[PDB]
Structures are given as structure tokens and as C-alpha cells.
Design a protein around this ligand. Structure first.
Ligand SMILES: CCCCCCCCCCCCCCCCCC(=O)OC[C@H](COP(=O)([O-])OCC(O)COP(=O)([O-])OC[C@@H](COC(=O)CCCCCCCCCCCCCCCCC)OC(=O)CCCCCCCCCCCCCCCCC)OC(=O)CCCCCCCCCCCCCCCCC
Ligand SMILES: CCCCCCCCCCCCCCCCCC(=O)OC[C@H](COP(=O)([O-])OCC(O)COP(=O)([O-])OC[C@@H](COC(=O)CCCCCCCCCCCCCCCCC)OC(=O)CCCCCCCCCCCCCCCCC)OC(=O)CCCCCCCCCCCCCCCCC
Ligand SMILES: CCCCCCCCCCCCCCCCCC(=O)OC[C@H](COP(=O)([O-])OCC(O)COP(=O)([O-])OC[C@@H](COC(=O)CCCCCCCCCCCCCCCCC)OC(=O)CCCCCCCCCCCCCCCCC)OC(=O)CCCCCCCCCCCCCCCCC
Ligand SMILES: CCCCCCCCCCCCCCCCCC(=O)OC[C@H](COP(=O)([O-])OCC[N+](C)(C)C)OC(=O)CCCCCCCCCCCCCCCCC
Ligand SMILES: CCCCCCCCCCCCCCCCCC(=O)OC[C@H](COP(=O)([O-])OCC[N+](C)(C)C)OC(=O)CCCCCCCCCCCCCCCCC
Ligand SMILES: CCCCCCCCCCCCO[C@@H]1O[C@H](CO)[C@@H](O[C@H]2O[C@H](CO)[C@@H](O)[C@H](O)[C@H]2O)[C@H](O)[C@H]1O
Ligand SMILES: CCCCCCCCCCCCO[C@@H]1O[C@H](CO)[C@@H](O[C@H]2O[C@H](CO)[C@@H](O)[C@H](O)[C@H]2O)[C@H](O)[C@H]1O
Lengths: 188, 67, 92, 37, 32, 97, 345, 66, 43
């Protein structure tokens, strides 16, 4: 016998509330849209991307969360990589607490996470640091390599050789059972 | 109600349109109600004659009109 | 007393429930369009709530520790009140 | 036989209600009553 | 009809008649 | 939309076999060391050997008339003593000697 | 109409096109649906759900009548942490410290690097504790409850300290540095070598803040922080116990494992980092937000005060501060827990 | 392993904690024509479909026999 | 680097890495035999 209580007002509350901002003295420290990416706020937009744009040309999605400092460190170089390679791919910026169904879809278990996607399963490569040894430059190098690889493979063999796999018949229902509604199956 | 419209032929419903009115008893108290035969005849434009049930004495309406 | 204003404020919110004792999300189907379904809540890759409900405080506790360390790297004399009060384990 | 029993009960319990034009789980799809306001 | 354009996926799954092919495939042990 | 132009059903078969083999490797990796090696190599191998030997070779039940003619099996291990009725598998070229 | 019980069933269903679809849905597309008039009804739905949960539980759960729990030598994550509560705690504190993160991102299986580091730290702690016990405990002649008590008392203590400091806006003030004595003033001025400024707030704030120069507004490494703290404590003659000191050292080590940016981003302050890493489900979220709002709007308008104007002020600040610290012991009996009270007594 | 050929599902406990689990529909309805029948209320079946269905009001004992 | 402090502690002997290659405390042929015995006895 296993159960979890359904939810609480705290859990269902806004995960991303506003916090106070300091005056321009705390900012003075020793260490002191974006026209190339798309911030995603809605699973509708995420699905549109994954099921149309990721079939046209590849996408690169950064899944972050506010509490993480590695995300803050990785944001700017990710924007530079986007400004470099937006001609060949699309670039998306996702918050896990705002759009969790996108995080469940991409099978991300730690943050920050890069996800290169093409055909929604023809090429899915997840780049992250589960240990805590890599750095932002290492992650971006791995992302560049993966993007080059997927581009080469899409050019390979007359555009084919990149066909979707298990999502052809699973529809990510074992990952997220709520896709039965999308598919129109009953739940009675 | 059911989608069972009685055939207005005299072999089934004797004396259907001999007079310009129909009558019915309604409910447990069996209240009387009189209805014009033209209001009733409007149904037999939606009636479908391929379908015949209950000793071939009742036809069926089209589902659009019935619903 | 007015210095312990904040102690009173903390003691006010003591046993208020959190997301660590329950599921982090819930589904709501649009009744007019049952194909449309929304997930209200947060992310979670966690299912040991029946254990974590007892140690829920550790996250903010360790945050407070890291911040006390940051303050003490500049001034270690902020704890002397508690040391003199005898709360910490110390061998005078 | 199971199907026969199911339909035989459906007849008696649905065909004379005036409240079940269809199933209540799909009443969202019906048109709206002009008499309610 | 050519071997290649027959065994192309689109023609194989949309326009072709794969009945004889799959019947031969099922009855392979009989022929062998 | 079934099938894609320029792609072959044989290429799709190769894709599928690759998927299946990769999944099998993943499931074997994320499994118990105590059980998987046995259940995947040692029981299949023993069953294969036994079934192949029975279905292919031909064997004989051997008896001996007298105990004085029994062999000396004291030294060799796992069989210290002769027992009559032993099943013995031989090759077709075997002679009585 | 005729009486519906006189009417033939198949004729009724041929007349009706809607309930045809209802029958096909449950008895043509399935073979196991019950022969009831309404299979879509809430009683049936909830019965199906409860049956689903009971079936899955009976199959998967660890029980006295186990179906699937069998031939278990290497356990999975959930069962491992359910049976070994000691390891769930250790594996979880390491995760939050090695990666400043939320419990919601707790990994299914940890890395072998993390496990090995845990074993090394266990070596360190058990060595120190065993040698201490060998020395002192013998010349004289349930761990779960103890750990729970220790952690509860510790979080209560740190909460009380944070409240005490927020009382005078000294809790998380950086790049400012609070000062309640001329000795501390000199000590923290030695950081910037006399450079920088000093700021004051009038007679409700019982301390004076110091701003170093922007090049020296950095945060220090946690090992350096611990060394500074301990050195000050031994200079004053109040050393911690060795077990606690080792605990601090291991905490500093796992914090060093984070790397260059261990607490703050480049253009970030410690208050912003705290509010960033703060759990949003936390009850004290609004309390901390209130405090930081007030602190920001006060420090925006804080006045500048030069050096010698403060020392004469720092004397009376020391006086009323020691008076408040004396009052603190009684104030803990007001609302602090019985543990804090008995430890103050 | 890389992770490309990972298990294409998530455990039911984790789904239950995520608020994602669905229990129902041992059966399914493949086509939207078949899904929206009980919601249309006016054409659950097209006319062609209706006349095709009218051929199977009874089982065929003749075909069974043959 | 972040993890260099931990990854410096991981330096092994030749005999250590031979023992790991062979999997002394991680294969457990006695456990394999116990599993086989229990599995056959469960028939
Ligand atoms: C894994 C999950 C589970 C998935 C299951 C999915 C469901 C589908 C499975 C198929 C369903 C049928 C299975 C029934 C149970 C099987 C037992 C059985 O019925 O047969 C017993 C019977 C033997 O039993 P017996 O007791 O000795 O009786 C002897 C009598 O003479 C008996 O002989 P007989 O005189 O009575 O004559 C009849 C006999 C005669 O049998 C024969 O003659 C066999 C030789 C026929 C050759 C015909 C020429 C074909 C040319 C090659 C075609 C390409 C094949 C490529 C490989 C297979 C592709 C599927 O055959 C039969 O009885 C009918 C069996 C064949 C029916 C057709 C089924 C074909 C398989 C279709 C599978 C499709 C989906 C699979 C799912 C894939 C996973 C996604 O079958 C056989 O004769 C042997 C089977 C063939 C083995 C040859 C292959 C060995 C592999 C090594 C060869 C080297 C090359 C390959 C190396 C690998 C490459 C890297
Ligand atoms: C020499 C040493 C010997 C030792 C072995 C050495 C290694 C050799 C190779 C492996 C041999 C062991 C094979 C064991 C496989 C079965 C049980 C198992 O262990 O799986 C655990 C393993 C892990 O399970 P899991 O982690 O708990 O769950 C993850 C899912 O499986 C993950 O699945 P998913 O989500 O990625 O995808 C869903 C999956 C579902 O897999 C499952 O999870 C359940 C599979 C159900 C198995 C039982 C089905 C039996 C049904 C009875 C058949 C009645 C047929 C009626 C026919 C009448 C028609 C006339 O779909 C499939 O791929 C299954 C396809 C096969 C089912 C065919 C059923 C008939 C439908 C026909 C469809 C048309 C053909 C395929 C079309 C595709 C394009 C070509 O399973 C898998 O990794 C995938 C399923 C395995 C499929 C078969 C793979 C090929 C095996 C080839 C056998 C040939 C052996 C002969 C060698 C030659 C000797 C001479
Ligand atoms: C030799 C083998 C036999 C032994 C093995 C037995 C295995 C089967 C076991 C079956 C057990 C069921 C038990 C009986 C059920 C009775 C209820 C019933 O059948 O409902 C009426 C039902 C009437 O159906 P209906 O609702 O009026 O619908 C008909 C439509 O109106 C007509 O229009 P339509 O549009 O629907 O279609 C027209 C036409 C044809 O469809 C078309 O539209 C045109 C296309 C037709 C061409 C296709 C050809 C068929 C296949 C090839 C045949 C040629 C030879 C192959 C050549 C090889 C290549 C060269 O329809 C048909 O031909 C119907 C096909 C018959 C299918 C039988 C249903 C059994 C389902 C399960 C079979 C299991 C097999 C496993 C599946 C996988 C196998 C790999 O009866 C039948 O049609 C089935 C006759 C079954 C007779 C089997 C005899 C068993 C006797 C059991 C009685 C109790 C035994 C006690 C003994 C003691 C004696 C006193
Ligand atoms: C011979 C006796 C068989 C009787 C028992 C089996 C049932 C009888 C029915 C035939 C069985 C086969 C049905 C196949 C259904 C799959 C169709 C399909 O499209 O799958 C996706 C594959 C993969 O497609 P794809 O991914 O490359 O590209 C398309 C992508 N989508 C789907 C998204 C559009 O399609 C194919 O390319 C053709 C596969 C079917 C042909 C292979 C038949 C398999 C049966 C043999 C099993 C062993 C395989 C190894 C054979 C080696 C030969 C030397
Ligand atoms: C008419 C016929 C009708 C019947 C249909 C006939 C066909 C289908 C019949 C199948 C039924 C039986 C299927 C049972 C399969 C049991 C096999 C099994 O699971 O193994 C036990 C292991 C044991 O795993 P486990 O012990 O961790 O967990 C098992 C279950 N519990 C938890 C309860 C103990 O299962 C696996 O994880 C591995 C299975 C996948 C691999 C299958 C073998 C092939 C391996 C090839 C790759 C080898 C890589 C080598 C690399 C070496 C370097 C690392
Ligand atoms: C409704 C859709 C139907 C689609 C599927 C159609 C299936 C077509 C295959 C069935 C046709 C016969 O199938 C075939 O029959 C013969 C005899 O029965 C079998 O042949 C086997 O038995 C016969 C008789 O002893 C032997 O001569 C032969 O050597 C042996 O291989 C084949 O093993 C089988 O493959
Ligand atoms: C991937 C391809 C796999 C396809 C499967 C091919 C079969 C694999 C097993 C081959 C094993 C061959 O091993 C060989 O088998 C035969 C038959 O048992 C034995 O041979 C024995 O029986 C045969 C038949 O009478 C005779 O040669 C002789 O009586 C005797 O030597 C050999 O002593 C053995 O060396």
C-alpha cells in the first residue's frame, strides 16, 4: 500500500514569485528576448516547437531553475552560442518550475541541462554535469559538437537516416500519462 | 421518448386525418392536450420509410429531427 | 523585545505545510475541451516524501549555515552572544 | 449475454427519462438553453 | 515496376499490393 | 503518414534491430549482477549443450556383469564408484575397443 | 409510443443511434468492461482506480506476501533509501551542499565519486571520534533520535541567531560589514588597510556598518572562513569541540567542491543569493522578503559617518549590546523551545 | 550506456508525485471519428456508416454453417 | 576546478585496479550460486 497526498496550496502556488530588488550599491562588487533565443512559458509553445520546428531544423533547449547558480553562470555563454549558431538551429530557454511537462518530456533530472533535439527522438542528446566537474565552457563545447553531429547526420543520406523512434508509437505516454488526452484516448 | 412513429395508414392507425385534431393523455393524472394534425404531420416529413419496427407498424425518424 | 520582533515572526509560522509532504502537481482537464489538460504545480524527480517530511527544514538550515559562514569570514564576533549564553558546545 | 443484459437495462433506464439525451459526461457539447438566464 | 521503387517505403505502404509478397513470405517453409 | 520517400524498409529493419539491441544492452547493464549473468549465459549454455547432445549424438546404457569387472574410480572426483545403467554418449566412429 | 418493455431490444437499439455508440465504446472496443447500464459513472471510475492501485501495490510492494520482491541483493533507489534511513540523510545532505539545490532534484542513484568522498569523510570523522573516545571516555573507568534532536536544535539555534541579527539589520549585509565594537572596527578595517567608508543609522540600529573598497568587496572561501572563526575563538579562549570542528571542516570542504562561484554570481550580492536559493514553499519566505525590503530601503538612505565619530558611539553600542545579549537568555524562555531553554540554563 | 536507448517510461510512484499518472482506459479509440461520437449528438455515425451497420443487425447463421 | 579536490583523492594501486577489474567484492559468485539454488528450489 503506497500513497501520496494529492497536493497543497503551497505546492500549487506560484513557483516563481517576485523578490525585492536592491539599490545600486549592493550591485557595486569586485566581480562586476536577446534577439537570438525564445523564452518558453507554455507547454503549447513547447509542443509546437518539438513537433514542427524540431522536424524542420534542430533545436537547442536550456532547462534551468532560479535557485541554481550554474544556470546563471551558463546563461550568457549560451546566449553567445545562440548568436553564433541561430542560422542552423533554434534556441529555447525553459524554466523547469514554470513548464515542468517540458522537463519531463526531455527526461532532465538535473539543472542546468542542454538538450539538442531533432525529430523529437531522431536525435536527442542531453548535456549536463551530474557530478559537478565540468564547467560552462565544457558544456558549450559538448553542445557545439552535438549540434555539428546532428547537422552532419541530417545532411547524410539525402535528408533521411534521422527518423523518429519510440515516440512513433509511445507518444511519451509512459513518460507523461497526460498525453492520452492529446491523443484523444478515453480515461473512463 | 422513443423513435417509433406510428404509420398513418388506416390498417394501423384507423382514422388518423379524418378530423383536424389529435388528443393525448399526459402523465399519471392523464391531463388532456389537443394538437393540430398539421403540427403532427410535420413529423412525417422527417420520417424514414426504410425502417419499420414493432410488427411493421412504426417507422423511425431521422436522427437529426428526433434529437 | 523589538529586537525579538523577528523571533516572534518566525514562531508565528511554525507548522505550515509544504510541498515536501505531498505531490508537487495536479492535473486539471478543460471541461469544454477534454483534449486540453493543464498541470498546476512544480517540477519534481522525488518520491520519498514519507521520509523527507521529517527533514524538510534541512535545506533552509544549510542555506543559513552557508550564509553565517559568509558573514563570519568578515566578522566572527557575531556569535559571541550565543557563546556567552552557552547554547553552543564549547569548552571554556 | 452480458451485452444483452446491458442493453436491456439501458433501454428501461434511458429511453424514457427526458433528461438523458446523451450521457452527462458529454453535456458540454450540447447547445445552450435559450430559456435559462 | 522496379525492385527499388517497389521496396521504397512510401510506395510499399501506400500504393503497392504486398499481399502476394507476404503470402510467399508466410509459405516460405512450404516452398523450401 | 506511413513510410518516407528515399528510405527503404531494409534500412528501417536495421534501425529497429539497432534499437532493440541497444535497449537490451541498457537493460542488462542496469540489472543485478547476482542474477543476470547466470540467467543469460549459464542456464542457456547448459540447456543448449544438453539439448544439442541429446538431439544430435546417440547414447547407450552400459552395464557390467560382475563387481570384479568394475573399474577403479576411487581417484577421479565426482564419481567414486561405478553404477550400472549409466548413459554414455558416443560418436558414430567409436569402436568396442 | 409502445411500452418500452414490450418493445424488442434490438429494434430499440436500431432506432437509437446514440446509445449504439455507447455500447460499441465499452463492449466492442473492450472485452472486460462490466455489464452494467453505466460503466462511465463515478462509482465505476473510482472502483477501477482503487483496483489499479491495489493491484500495483500487491505486485510491487515489499510485504510478507511478496510477488516481485524476490532475489534481492542489489536494491533500487527507493527501496534502498526506505530500508536504510541513515544513508538517505547522508546522501541528501551531500547533494544539497555539493550542489546548491532543491530536494526535488534529488538524483535517483548517486555518483560513485560522491559515494567515495562520503566514505573518506566518514574515515576522517570516525578516526577523530574514536581517538577522542579512546583518550577520555575510558580513563573515567538509537542514532536516529539523537540525529533528529541534534538537527532540530541546530536549525532552531541558527534561526534564533538570524532573528537576533535581523533585529538590528546585521543578518545578511554585504558588501557592508557590521561592527559593534572598536576592536571589530579595527579588525575589519585591517581588511581594506584603512580604506573605505563607514555608515550609520540612528539609534534604532545598534551597530555601525563598514564599506570596503570595490576591489575588496569579495566573499572569502569557506575554509578561510572556518579558519578565521576558529582562530578568533581560540584567541578569545573558547574553542569548539573537536567533533564539531571536524563537522565544520567537512562542510567547508564539500562547499569548496562547488568551485569558483560557490555562493554568488559575479554581479550578485549575498542577499540576492539567499533569496534566490530560498525555498519558495518555505513558511519564512514572506518574513525574509519583508526583512530584505526594509533593509534595502534603509541602506539606500543610510548616512555616512567618519571614523572617530563612531568609536565614542561604539562604546555605548557595546554597552547596550551586552545588555541586550543578557536579555537574550531570558528572551529564549519566552518563545524558544524547551531545548534552547534548558541549554541556556 | 549513452542514454539514447533508455527505458521510454517513468515509474508510477514518480508520476504520482509529479501529479501526472492516469489509470484508465484499458481500451482506446484510434480514430477521431470514433472518439467524438458521444459528443456529436447529431451524427454519431455518418449515413454511409449507418447503412453499413444495418447489415449486421443479426449474426449470420448461414455463414456460420457454411 | 570544482571537483578537482575530490578527484585528487581517487588514486589507486596496480593491485587495487587489478582487483577491481576482476570484481572481487562486486561479482559474488557465492551469491550467484545461492540465487541459482533458490531459483531451482522454487520449482
Ligand atoms: C522474441 C519475442 C517473441 C516474438 C515472437 C513474435 C511472434 C512471431 C514469431 C513467429 C511465430 C512462429 C513461431 C512458432 C514457434 C517456433 C517453433 C516452430 O514452430 O518451429 C519449429 C520447427 C522446428 O521444430 P522441430 O521439432 O525440429 O520439427 C521439425 C519438423 O521438420 C518441422 O518441420 P515441418 O516439416 O513440419 O515444416 C514446417 C516447419 C518447417 O520449418 C522450416 O522449414 C524452417 C526453414 C524455412 C526457411 C524458408 C526460407 C526463408 C528464407 C529466409 C527468410 C528470411 C528469414 C530471416 C530470419 C527470420 C526472420 C523472422 O515450419 C513450421 O512448422 C512453421 C514455422 C515457421 C512459420 C513462419 C514463422 C517465421 C517467423 C516470423 C517471425 C516474424 C516476427 C518475429 C518478431 C521479430 C521481433 C521484432 O521450425 C524449424 O523448422 C526451425 C525454425 C527455423 C530456424 C532457422 C534459423 C536458425 C537461425 C540460425 C540460422 C543461420 C542464419 C541466421 C543467423 C542469424 C543472423 C545474424
Ligand atoms: C547465444 C546466447 C543466447 C543468450 C541470448 C543472447 C542474446 C541474443 C539476443 C536476445 C535473446 C533474448 C531475447 C529476449 C527478449 C524477450 C524477453 C526479454 O528478455 O526482454 C527483456 C528486455 C527488457 O525488458 P524491460 O526493460 O522490462 O522493458 C522495456 C521494453 O521492453 C522496451 O521496449 P520498447 O519500449 O523500446 O518498445 C516496445 C517493445 C515491446 O517489448 C516488450 O516490452 C514486450 C515484448 C512482448 C514479448 C512477448 C510477446 C510474445 C507474444 C506471443 C506471440 C504471438 C504471435 C501471434 C502471431 C500470429 C500471426 C499469424 O516493442 C518491441 O520491440 C517488441 C517487438 C517483438 C514483439 C513481437 C510481437 C508480435 C508483433 C509483431 C510486430 C511486427 C514485427 C516487428 C515490427 C518492427 C519492424 C521490424 O526487453 C527488451 O529490451 C525489448 C523487448 C525484446 C523484443 C525482442 C528482441 C529481439 C529478440 C530476438 C530473439 C531471437 C533469439 C534467437 C537467436 C538465434 C538462435 C539460433
Ligand atoms: C480448419 C481450421 C478450423 C479449426 C481451428 C478453429 C480455430 C477458430 C476457433 C473459432 C471458435 C469460435 C467458436 C464458434 C463461434 C460461434 C459464433 C459465431 O461464429 O458467430 C457467427 C459468425 C457469423 O458472423 P457475422 O456476425 O454474421 O458476420 C459475417 C458478416 O455478415 C459477413 O460479411 P463481412 O463483411 O463480415 O465479411 C465477409 C466474410 C469474409 O470477409 C470479407 O469481407 C471478404 C474477405 C474474405 C477473404 C479472406 C479469406 C479468409 C482467410 C483465408 C481462407 C482461405 C484458405 C487459406 C489459403 C492460404 C493461401 C493460399 O466474412 C467471413 O468470412 C468471416 C471469417 C470467419 C472468421 C471466424 C471468426 C473466428 C475469430 C478467431 C479466429 C482465430 C484465428 C486466430 C487469428 C490468427 C491466425 C493466424 O460465424 C462466423 O462467421 C464464423 C464461423 C466459425 C466456424 C468455425 C467452426 C468452429 C465450431 C465451434 C462450435 C462449437 C464446437 C463444439 C463441437 C460440438 C459440435 C456439436
Ligand atoms: C513470416 C511469418 C510471419 C508471421 C508472424 C508475424 C505476423 C505477420 C505479419 C508480418 C510481420 C511483420 C510486420 C511488420 C510491421 C512493422 C512495419 C513497420 O513499419 O515497422 C517500422 C519499420 C521502421 O520504419 P522507419 O523508422 O525506418 O521509417 C519510418 C518511420 N515512421 C514509422 C515514423 C514513419 O518500418 C520498416 O522499415 C519495415 C519494417 C517491416 C518489415 C520487417 C518485417 C518484420 C518481421 C521479421 C522480423 C525479423 C526482422 C529481421 C528480418 C531480417 C531479414 C534478413
Ligand atoms: C507459443 C510461444 C508463446 C510464448 C512466447 C515465447 C517468446 C517470449 C517468451 C519470453 C518469456 C520469458 C522472458 C524472460 C526473460 C528473462 C531474462 C532476464 O530478464 O534476465 C534476467 C535479468 C535480471 O535482472 P534483475 O535481476 O536486475 O531484475 C529482475 C527482476 N527482479 C528485480 C525481480 C529480480 O534481467 C535483466 O535485467 C536483463 C534482461 C535483458 C537482457 C536479455 C538477455 C540478452 C542480453 C544481451 C546483451 C548482453 C550484453 C553483454 C555485455 C557484457 C558487458 C557488460
Ligand atoms: C485473413 C488474412 C490471412 C492472411 C494470412 C494467410 C496465411 C497463409 C498461410 C497458410 C497457407 C498454408 O500454409 C502452409 O500450409 C502447409 C500445409 O498446411 C504447410 O506445409 C507443411 O505441411 C505440409 C503437409 O504436411 C507439407 O507438405 C510441407 O512440407 C510442410 O512445410 C506450411 O507449413 C504452411 O506454411
Ligand atoms: C550463428 C550460426 C550458428 C548456427 C548453428 C550451427 C550449429 C552450432 C553447433 C555446431 C557444433 C559442431 O560440433 C560438432 O557437432 C557434431 C555433431 O554433434 C559432432 O560430430 C559427431 O556427430 C556427427 C554426426 O554423427 C559425426 O560427425 C560424428 O558422429 C561425431 O563427430 C562433432 O564432434 C562436433 O565437433
Amino acid at each position: 500500500s503506497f500513497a501520496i497526498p494529492p497536493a497543497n496550496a503551497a505546492a500549487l502556488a506560484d513557483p516563481l514569485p517576485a523578490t525585492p530588488t536592491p539599490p545600486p550599491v549592493f550591485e557595486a562588487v569586485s566581480s562586476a528576448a536577446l534577439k537570438n533565443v525564445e523564452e518558453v512559458s507554455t507547454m503549447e509553445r513547447y509542443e509546437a516547437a518539438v513537433y514542427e520546428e524540431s522536424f524542420k531544423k534542430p533545436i537547442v533547449c536550456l532547462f534551468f531553475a532560479r535557485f541554481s547558480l550554474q544556470s546563471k553562470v551558463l546563461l550568457q555563454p549560451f546566449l553567445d552560442f545562440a548568436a553564433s549558431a541561430s542560422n542552423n538551429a533554434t534556441f529555447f530557454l525553459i524554466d523547469c518550475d514554470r513548464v515542468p511537462r517540458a522537463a519531463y518530456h526531455a527526461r532532465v533530472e538535473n539543472v542546468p541541462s542542454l538538450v539538442v533535439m531533432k525529430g523529437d527522438d531522431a536525435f536527442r542528446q542531453t548535456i549536463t554535469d551530474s557530478v559537478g566537474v565540468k564547467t560552462a565552457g565544457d558544456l558549450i563545447q559538448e553542445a557545439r559538437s552535438a549540434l555539428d553531429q546532428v547537422l552532419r547526420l541530417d545532411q547524410q543520406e539525402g535528408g533521411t537516416k534521422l527518423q523518429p523512434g519510440v515516440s512513433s508509437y509511445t507518444h511519451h505516454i509512459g513518460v507523461d500519462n497526460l498525453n492520452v488526452y492529446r491523443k484523444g484516448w478515453p480515461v473512463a | 421518448m422513443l423513435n417509433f412513429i406510428p404509420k398513418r395508414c388506416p390498417s394501423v392507425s384507423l382514422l388518423f386525418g379524418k378530423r383536424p385534431v389529435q388528443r393525448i393523455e399526459v402523465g399519471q393524472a392523464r391531463h388532456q392536450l389537443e394538437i393540430p394534425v398539421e403540427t403532427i404531420e410535420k413529423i412525417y416529413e422527417g420520417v424514414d420509410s426504410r425502417l419499420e419496427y414493432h410488427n411493421k407498424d412504426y417507422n423511425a425518424m431521422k436522427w437529426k429531427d428526433f434529437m | 523585545a523589538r529586537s525579538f520582533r523577528w523571533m516572534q515572526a518566525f514562531a508565528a509560522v511554525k507548522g505550515k505545510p509544504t510541498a515536501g509532504s505531498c505531490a508537487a502537481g495536479t492535473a486539471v482537464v478543460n471541461p469544454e475541451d477534454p483534449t486540453k489538460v493543464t498541470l498546476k504545480g512544480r517540477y519534481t524527480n522525488f518520491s520519498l516524501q514519507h521520509i523527507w517530511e521529517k527533514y524538510d527544514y534541512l535545506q533552509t538550515h544549510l542555506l543559513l549555515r552557508e550564509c553565517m559562514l559568509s558573514q563570519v569570514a568578515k566578522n566572527p564576533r557575531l556569535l559571541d552572544p550565543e557563546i556567552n549564553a552557552g547554547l553552543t558546545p564549547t569548552v571554556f | 449475454g452480458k451485452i444483452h443484459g446491458a442493453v436491456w437495462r439501458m433501454k428501461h433506464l434511458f429511453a424514457t427519462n427526458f433528461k438523458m439525451v446523451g450521457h452527462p459526461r458529454y453535456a458540454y457539447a450540447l447547445p445552450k438553453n435559450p430559456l435559462l438566464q | 515496376v522496379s525492385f527499388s521503387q517497389f521496396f521504397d517505403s512510401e510506395y510499399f505502404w501506400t500504393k503497392a499490393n504486398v499481399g502476394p509478397f507476404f503470402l510467399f513470405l508466410f509459405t516460405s517453409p512450404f516452398w523450401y | 503518414p506511413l513510410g518516407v520517400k528515399g528510405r527503404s524498409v531494409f534500412a528501417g529493419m536495421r534501425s529497429f534491430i539497432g534499437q532493440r539491441l541497444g535497449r537490451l544492452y541498457d537493460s542488462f547493464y542496469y540489472s543485478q549482477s547476482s542474477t543476470k549473468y547466470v540467467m543469460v549465459f549459464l542456464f542457456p549454455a547448459g540447456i543448449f549443450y544438453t539439448r544439442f547432445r541429446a538431439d544430435t549424438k546417440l547414447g547407450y546404457h552400459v552395464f557390467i556383469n560382475e563387481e570384479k569387472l568394475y573399474p577403479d574410480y576411487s581417484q577421479n572426483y565426482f564419481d567414486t564408484k561405478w553404477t550400472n545403467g549409466r548413459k554414455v554418449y558416443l560418436d558414430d566412429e567409436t569402436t568396442v575397443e | 409510443n409502445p411500452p418500452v418493455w414490450k418493445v424488442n431490444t434490438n429494434e430499440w437499439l436500431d432506432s437509437d443511434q446514440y446509445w449504439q455508440a455507447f455500447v460499441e465504446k465499452h463492449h466492442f472496443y473492450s472485452q472486460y468492461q462490466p455489464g452494467v447500464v453505466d460503466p462511465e459513472a463515478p462509482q465505476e471510475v473510482e472502483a477501477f482506480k482503487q483496483a489499479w492501485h491495489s493491484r500495483m501495490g500487491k505486485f510491487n510492494d515489499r510485504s510478507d506476501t511478496p510477488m516481485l520482491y524476490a532475489y534481492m541483493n542489489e536494491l533500487p533507489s527507493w527501496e534502498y533509501y526506505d530500508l536504510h534511513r541513515s544513508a538517505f540523510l547522508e546522501h541528501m545532505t551531500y547533494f544539497l551542499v555539493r550542489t546548491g539545490g532543491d530536494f526535488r532534484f534529488f538524483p535517483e542513484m548517486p555518483p560513485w565519486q560522491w559515494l567515495a568522498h562520503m566514505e573518506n569523510l566518514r574515515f576522517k570523522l570516525l578516526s577523530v571520534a574514536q581517538s577522542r573516545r579512546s583518550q577520555l571516555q575510558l580513563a573515567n573507568l538509537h542514532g536516529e533520535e539523537y540525529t533528529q534532536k541534534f538537527l532540530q536544535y541546530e536549525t532552531e539555534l541558527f534561526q534564533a541567531c538570524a532573528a537576533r541579527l535581523m533585529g538590528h539589520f546585521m543578518f545578511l549585509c554585504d558588501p557592508f560589514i557590521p561592527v559593534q565594537s572598536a576592536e571589530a572596527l579595527s579588525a575589519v578595517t585591517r581588511v581594506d588597510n584603512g580604506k573605505g567608508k563607514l555608515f550609520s543609522l540612528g539609534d534604532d540600529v545598534n551597530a555601525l556598518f563598514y564599506l570596503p573598497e570595490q576591489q575588496r568587496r569579495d566573499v572569502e572561501r569557506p575554509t578561510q572562513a572556518v579558519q578565521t572563526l576558529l582562530g578568533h575563538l581560540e584567541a578569545t579562549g573558547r574553542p569548539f569541540n573537536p567533533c564539531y570542528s571536524e563537522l565544520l571542516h567537512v562542510h567547508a570542504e564539500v562547499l569548496e567542491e562547488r568551485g569558483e562561484h560557490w555562493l554568488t554570481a559575479p554581479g550578485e550580492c549575498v542577499s540576492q543569493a539567499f533569496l534566490r536559493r530560498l525555498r519558495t514553499d518555505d513558511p519564512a519566505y514572506e518574513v525574509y522578503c519583508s526583512y530584505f525590503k526594509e533593509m534595502y530601503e534603509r541602506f539606500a538612505g543610510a548616512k555616512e559617518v567618519s571614523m572617530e565619530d563612531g568609536r565614542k558611539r561604539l562604546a555605548t553600542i557595546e554597552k547596550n549590546a551586552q545588555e541586550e545579549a543578557a536579555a537574550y537568555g531570558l528572551a529564549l524562555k519566552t518563545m524558544g523551545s524547551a531545548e534552547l531553554a534548558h541549554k541556556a540554563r | 550506456p549513452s542514454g539514447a536507448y533508455r527505458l521510454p517510461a517513468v515509474d508510477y510512484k514518480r508520476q504520482l508525485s509529479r501529479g501526472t499518472l492516469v489509470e484508465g482506459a484499458d481500451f482506446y479509440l484510434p480514430t477521431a471519428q470514433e472518439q467524438q461520437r458521444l459528443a456529436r449528438h447529431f451524427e454519431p455515425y455518418s449515413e454511409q456508416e449507418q447503412e453499413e451497420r444495418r447489415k449486421f443487425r443479426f449474426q449470420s447463421i448461414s455463414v456460420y454453417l457454411a | 576546478r570544482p571537483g578537482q579536490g575530490s578527484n585528487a583523492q581517487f588514486q589507486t594501486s596496480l593491485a587495487d585496479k587489478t582487483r577491481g577489474l576482476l570484481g572481487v567484492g562486486f561479482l559474488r559468485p557465492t551469491k550467484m550460486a545461492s540465487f541459482a539454488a533458490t531459483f531451482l528450489l522454487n520449482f
